Design a protein around this ligand. Structure first.
Ligand SMILES: [Ca+2]
Ligand SMILES: [Ca+2]
Ligand SMILES: [Mg+2]
Ligand SMILES: [Mg+2]
Lengths: 548, 548
């Protein structure tokens, strides 16, 4: 099976991981010097956030050169050293392809804004690279994604005297994918990095590629068309490489980004639909929305694999939940208005869960036990907090906390000279929360995460097995089976904060012997009608094997 | 009924708790300013470690003046203000009465080592306050308690040309309790403090008052008589004041330090027999130990109440335990040789349990649920560690860690200037383990301990009920009821580090529904023959209520 199906992912920003020269910004030489840490954590694949030259108006997602390294982060040779040294340890590394839009400082758009026709006689080839409007009335009935900061997806450009389109900030003008010249430009930027030996791409914001008047301008077939062209190129020209899609839509729409077996698209998509339902189910102590939303995801093609996660560099997004659910999630997890941003919640995993390690453990359990490949977000393995006095989603991207020395070992610059300030409070600051202390503590959250990934890595049914929900008689208790290659695991999880009893329907497995995955503690044989009484402590997780 | 039966005790030492004036030594003004903290934690009664003038060769337990305040800790003035502010918060205060022995620098031993008769001709009435011999040959068949330091319980005095008796250090000569003037002198010392409003005394080294030839010199009939007369004096004269006794012995001998209804002795005694079995059942994952030794405890008088603890200012003592049990304890809990001392182990609780919060919560659960009155060792509520670079048993008496500031908030003197250095290592140092942090953390151990304590006081069967073990089918699971005034608690505890199944024998309670104590979540009703199946996750505790 493909490497990505068996891999564990780790999402970092090199501007925020490890500063190597005291300017207060993370860089590639600083990341390289930490590769052993990630290896020994149990990670296989590093997903780096954008590293290209950029004014950093959307923290680097507004690219002004698709084929360079941002001068903050080092040189193209620093990048090459880092790639051969990650590969030498057997890590894979994937990039972030920002295909929907460039920065307005990108030279294509400095060219395009001159207008269809140059001051010179001739037509401007670059004008058609972007999406222009005389009045800016097209594509109405089209939501605004960045809702706390933009009032329209059209913006007036003094130079061109026309309107240009942008799904995100005005600093990020959309690329026009109806121009074949733009599709080649994208292909050629991907080739440049694959040629360097990068292992693949997380492709950002795929639903918003093609616009069409009279539609929502999400998930249009033309978009899927272009995406299949990209997969067809990679298949032909770089077999083995991974394309991974960010596509925050509803179950029915997300699954289309795998394409089909006849016409493949992405190898992987994030499982955005479950992520918010995990959090809500913990507050209602009812797990049915996990079962409902999981049950709407169809099966995916053979090459496919879900990517599963709890948090990331962005807001905990609520754009694709019911209106009732979003109101509930705000009251439950954003009690201060400062905690919201756009249509989401800008908080890290530990503070979302009141820093309760029993809860952090339970959720990481469910992350690791669901059909997919897990991606961890840097710092959640040590329980990092957030800095809510920082603009946009930056309070969730503070520097990695390595020890209790200057700026948590991230830099020898002082906290207020760092790009973002490292967190310094009594609960989450680097005095209390850092890698070094957790390397020496036998019962660390970090030690726990490592040992828990070891446990998954010894049981391939987690990566490759099917999934079937067991009836339980108690909505607080979620049980399911993962089956593959003969092995049958049974995962049992309590979303309630006190003891719960359940009655599992194990009728398909009468005569079988449940043992724990850790130390094979035996449990009673499934007998009779297979209805199986269980009791569970607050936030307990049972990882079982049903022996035939 | 009697206030000590229903109280939570907290053991601290003034010198290491809080320094008010910045000389690096804890003082009574500093302790006074922290009474809010202990009141809020849920503590009812402070239990102070010897505060008297001393050369501190055994850390205050070698007393040189029974009626004063050691100048390190302030004046008798400051101690008065302390008792007032404690009492104004509804806090009882008991002291330590060190009764078997005094310091070489006590005026009595100075006067006594001047021979049986003086230079002038008169008799020396002080020579007989202490126990002398000419050859040092009486009382073999007697052990050395400080096996690591002392080779004989006799020690020649250069100046008196005789040997004096001492159970502990040669710096702490044993007082002679065949001399009735000594008894009066102790009643005189106790009344000094009772008269100031102290609420009682723990009496240390109580089993060693009387020596007799041919005998063990422990637990002697004449020893209980002096004690019986101390109880009489107190009851007759300061009624309602508490007498607590440290007596590290086998169960059948410890129970008679209560004496009887006819002849009362102590109100309370430390339950030394069970405490080392909690630790052994954890490692063996086998609670048979605890049940064996609890059944060997005979019933106690009506005024009687056990005092349960996990740890104290001393080594974890293994003297009163089997050779095989001691070898098991050392291998499991003393990996390094200098963690051993005096047939014991000198580590604090959190290091003993590998800093595993699940293991720490579990044993605090059992401390709080066994029948008796619990005593907390200071800093265990936040998870302090120990320092083995300090001699003797001082490694567990580090300054209380209040916040991340200078010397952990214990003093403005910097760490090398403190009486004992405050701990600074990466796992248990004050930058990471401290009170202010855990006040702010919604999910801290300090907060878990306070909540668990107020969950206990809400259910008076813990303090007063009886105890009945319950069959379980699985040695790793301990289960028992506490019954009192028509309330039946049910306590189920998993001492294994993975999931365990049990069959709870609940026949008496058929028809009744087990209800969770935290949140009132109901479990299914006990049907059929009372055989009630359960599963439990690693180190789980269930605190249940049975309702008819
Ligand atoms: Ca677009
Ligand atoms: Ca004596
Ligand atoms: Mg730098
Ligand atoms: Mg002082």
């Amino acid at each position: 099976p493909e490497w990505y199906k068996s891999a564990v992912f780790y999402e970092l920003s090199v501007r925020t991981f490890q500063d190597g020269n005291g300017d207060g910004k993370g860089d590639f030489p600083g990341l390289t010097s930490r590769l052993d840490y990630l290896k020994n954590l149990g990670v296989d694949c590093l997903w780096l956030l954008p590293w290209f030259p950029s004014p950093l108006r959307d923290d680097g997602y507004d690219v002004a050169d698709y084929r360079g390294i941002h001068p903050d982060l080092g040189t193209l040779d620093d990048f090459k050293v880092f790639l051969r040294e990650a590969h030498a340890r057997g890590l894979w590394v994937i990039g972030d392809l920002v295909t929907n839009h460039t920065s307005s400082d990108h030279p294509w758009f400095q060219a395009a804004r001159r207008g269809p026709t140059l001051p010179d006689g001739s037509p401007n080839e670059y004008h058609d690279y972007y999406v222009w409007s005389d009045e800016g009335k097209e594509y109405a009935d089209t939501r605004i994604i960045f809702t706390d900061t933009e009032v329209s997806n059209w913006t007036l450009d003094e130079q061109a005297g026309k309107y240009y389109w942008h799904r995100f900030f005005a600093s990020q003008p959309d690329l026009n994918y109806d121009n074949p010249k733009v599709v080649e430009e994208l292909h050629g930027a991907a080739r440049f990095w694959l040629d360097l030996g990068l292992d693949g791409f997380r492709v950002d914001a795929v639903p918003y590629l093609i616009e069409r008047e009279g539609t929502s301008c999400e998930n249009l077939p033309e978009t899927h068309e272009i995406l299949k062209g990209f997969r067809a190129m990679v298949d032909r020209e770089y077999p083995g490489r991974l394309l991974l899609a960010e596509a925050c839509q509803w179950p029915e729409e997300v699954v289309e980004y795998f394409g089909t077996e006849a016409e493949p698209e992405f190898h992987m998509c994030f499982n955005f639909p479950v992520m918010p339902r995990l959090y809500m189910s913990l507050k209602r102590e009812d797990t049915s929305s996990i079962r409902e939303i999981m049950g709407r995801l169809p099966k995916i093609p053979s090459f496919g694999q879900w990517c599963i996660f709890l948090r990331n560099h962005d807001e905990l997004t609520l754009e694709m939940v019911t209106d009732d659910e979003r109101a509930f999630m705000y009251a439950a997890y954003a009690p201060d208005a400062r905690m919201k941003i756009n249509v989401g919640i800008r908080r890290r995993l530990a503070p979302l869960l009141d820093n309760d390690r029993r809860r952090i453990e339970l959720l990481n359990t469910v992350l690791l036990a669901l059909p997919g490949s897990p991606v961890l977000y840097y710092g959640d393995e040590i329980g990092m907090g957030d800095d809510l006095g920082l603009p946009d989603r930056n309070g969730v991207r503070t520097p990695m906390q390595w020890n209790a020395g200057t700026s948590g070992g991230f830099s020898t610059a002082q906290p207020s000279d760092c790009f973002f300030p490292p967190i310094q409070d009594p609960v989450y600051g680097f005095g209390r929360v850092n890698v070094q202390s957790q390397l020496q503590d036998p019962s660390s959250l970090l030690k726990w995460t490592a040992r828990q990934l070891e446990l998954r890595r010894a049981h391939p049914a987690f990566a490759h097995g099917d999934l079937t929900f067991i009836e339980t008689g108690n909505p607080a208790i979620l049980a399911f089976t993962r089956q593959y290659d003969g092995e049958t695991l049974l995962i049992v999880s309590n979303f309630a904060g006190n003891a719960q009893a359940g009655l599992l329907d194990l009728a398909p497995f009468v005569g079988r012997a449940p043992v724990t995955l850790s130390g094979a503690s035996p449990l009673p044989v499934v007998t009779g009608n297979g209805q199986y009484p269980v009791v569970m402590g607050k936030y307990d997780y049972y990882w079982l094997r049903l022996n035939s």
